Nucleic acid binder design. Structure first.
Ligand SMILES: [Mn+2]
Length: 440
RNA sequence: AGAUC
């Protein structure tokens, strides 16, 4: 557990705190109050807007500069503590700007494998190792450890069973015979839609959660009755339910780079241990309501090296300026997930600004932005969106999607580099069509 | 699938 000793330079502390143990509502305030007392320049790193909003609740009234729109408080101007999301921190490290020389970095959910979180751990741990700063990483599953069954406030009954992943008409009576409340993690929105329809058909009350619907739908879990929450991994962090069962497919979709050539949303494939621990961690939280059960349908992923986020983290970190041209390393327990030589992705000055602008203003995925920038293409030149090979054609409703270009021509979306994330769902395609049209 | 400005 935490002690003020850990606030000295050259100390990186990983607080292994199991789900429900108090990372956000107990330990984080404790750390922040001591940093405020001792006037340490501190940044708090939340993985998501949601967790940031949860953080402000727990830090209510303390002098914290919230560098996120997810929170709106009056700032005194004397605030020495900043709060932002992992991706915001990493993006700002990429700008030609003045990053404060924070003495203390506090990262909550330090297992997050978003490429910007991985890159932030690399930068932060390198700065600690150089003697410049102190850092505290909090998670239930410290990087480098593979325990899918961490401790809990109340004992959890874990049972491996065949978990249905499609609509069913028989053979799974235990799903619907249950009279409690179930949180069911599914690999995708479309997959949860089919299961939710099947459960609704059988007379259950279902709330569905995803990135696209979380805002409006999650509050319903607080105020309406419900039998099932069917959720994507949106609910792995910063989401809590009054449930007594989790059903876990133990699968996910994850971006994968095929042959160095393109990015697909591979799967469904096994989740990591960290993600299984988070999913299981939705229950077993209430010592007054024992009896919770975790029903899971397969193993966890033994190697995450196929995940594109590892290489994308190195693309960010190779281009984050440290000191007179040094390059930060990935956080050591995770450094073996990428086999690329040191500095392989460092871009020269001009191509680097393009990569940065492609990601921030352009909102392209890291891997894609890097392909464009490293080809010498300028930010506003969108011709590559239309001149790929035929197998790069983006479909809409099984018909080649089309775009009115800045030159008043209707062209089929066929990007020179295919990254499935630009058209994996409706909002993504819409954002990329605007990009291909020259609108941002 | 997720993520930020
Ligand atoms: Mn927490």
């Amino acid at each position: 557990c935490f002690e003020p000793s850990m606030l000295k330079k050259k100390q990186l502390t990983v607080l292994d705190l199991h789900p429900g143990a108090g990372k956000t509502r107990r330990v984080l305030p404790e750390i922040v109050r001591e940093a405020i007392k001792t006037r340490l320049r501190t940044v708090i790193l939340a993985p998501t807007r949601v967790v940031a909003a949860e953080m402000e609740e727990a830090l209510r009234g303390l002098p914290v500069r919230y560098m996120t729109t997810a929170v709106n408080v009056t700032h005194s101007g004397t605030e020495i503590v900043d709060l932002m999301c992992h991706a915001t921190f990493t993006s700002r490290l990429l700008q030609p700007i003045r990053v404060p020389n924070y003495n203390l970095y506090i990262m909550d959910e330090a297992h997050f494998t978003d490429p910007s979180s991985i890159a932030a751990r690399g930068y932060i741990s390198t700065r600690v190792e150089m003697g410049e700063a102190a850092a505290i990483f909090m998670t239930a599953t410290p990087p480098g450890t593979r325990d899918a069954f961490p401790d809990s406030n109340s004992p959890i009954m874990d049972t491996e069973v065949e978990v249905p992943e499609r609509a069913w008409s028989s053979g799974f009576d235990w799903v619907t015979d249950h009279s409690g409340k179930t949180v069911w993690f599914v690999p995708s929105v479309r997959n949860g839609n089919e299961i939710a329809a099947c459960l609704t058909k059988a007379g259950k009350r279902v709330i569905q959660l995803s990135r696209k619907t979380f805002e409006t739908e999650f509050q319903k879990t607080k105020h309406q009755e419900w039998d099932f929450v069917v959720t994507t991994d949106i609910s792995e962090m910063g989401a809590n339910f009054k449930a007594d069962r989790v059903i876990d497919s133990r699968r996910c979709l994850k971006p994968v780079i095929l042959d160095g050539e393109r990015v697909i949303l591979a799967g469904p494939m096994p989740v990591t241990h960290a993600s299984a621990a988070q999913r299981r961690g939705r229950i077993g939280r209430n010592p007054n309501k024992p009896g919770d059960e975790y029903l899971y349908g397969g193993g966890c992923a033994e190697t995450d090296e196929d995940h594109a986020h590892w290489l994308e983290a190195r693309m960010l970190l190779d281009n984050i300026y440290l000191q007179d041209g040094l390059i930060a390393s990935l956080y050591r327990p995770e450094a073996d997930k990428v086999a690329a030589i040191e500095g392989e992705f460092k871009l020269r000055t001009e191509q680097r600004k393009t990569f940065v602008e492609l990601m921030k203003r352009g909102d392209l995925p890291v891997w894609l932005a890097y392909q464009v920038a490293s080809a010498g293409i300028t930010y506003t030149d969108r011709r590559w969106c239309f001149d790929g090979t035929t197998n790069n054609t983006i479909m809409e409703d099984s018909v080649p999607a089309e775009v009115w270009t800045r030159h008043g021509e209707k062209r089929v979306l066929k990007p020179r580099w295919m990254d499935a994330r630009v058209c994996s769902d409706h909002a993504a395609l819409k954002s990329f069509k605007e990009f291909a049209a020259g609108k941002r």
